[PDB]
């Protein structure tokens, strides 16, 4: 039973890192490219 | 940065209208100035 348990977290916290990464990600990429565009406007 | 950056595009669109107004204007007076030059220079086509 707490074997089952475990397991199933570290499938949550995995899923839920590969979630954080991609919200995160995308944000940082836009920044990048909202900052070029700043520079381009300039 | 994204107020910013739509702040500055407003900024931008409003300074390219005015600079394509006064580019028009420009232009205008420039046409008004070359018939005006055109007319001397019938004029003094005539004399001579």
Same mark, same amino acid.
């Given at each position: 039973?707490?074997?089952?348990?475990? &397991?199933?977290?570290?499938?949550?916290?995995?899923?839920?890192?590969?979630?954080?990464?991609?919200?995160?990600?995308?944000? &940082?990429?836009?920044?990048?490219?909202?900052?070029? &565009?700043?520079?381009?406007?300039? | 940065? #994204?107020?910013?950056? *739509?702040?500055? +595009?407003?900024?931008?669109?409003?300074?390219?209208?005015? *600079?394509?107004?006064?580019?028009?204007? *420009?232009?205008? #007076?420039?046409?008004?100035?070359?018939?005006?030059?055109?007319? +001397?220079?019938?004029? *003094? #086509?005539?004399?001579?």
């Amino acid at each position: 039973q707490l074997e089952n348990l475990i &397991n199933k977290w570290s499938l949550e916290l995995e899923d839920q890192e590969k979630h954080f990464l991609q919200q995160a990600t995308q944000v &940082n990429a836009w920044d990048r490219t909202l900052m070029q &565009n700043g520079e381009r406007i300039t | 940065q #994204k107020e910013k950056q *739509l702040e500055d +595009l407003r900024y931008c669109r409003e300074e390219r209208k005015s *600079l394509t107004e006064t580019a028009e204007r *420009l232009a205008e #007076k420039f046409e008004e100035a070359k018939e005006k030059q055109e007319d +001397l220079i019938n004029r *003094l #086509k005539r004399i001579l």
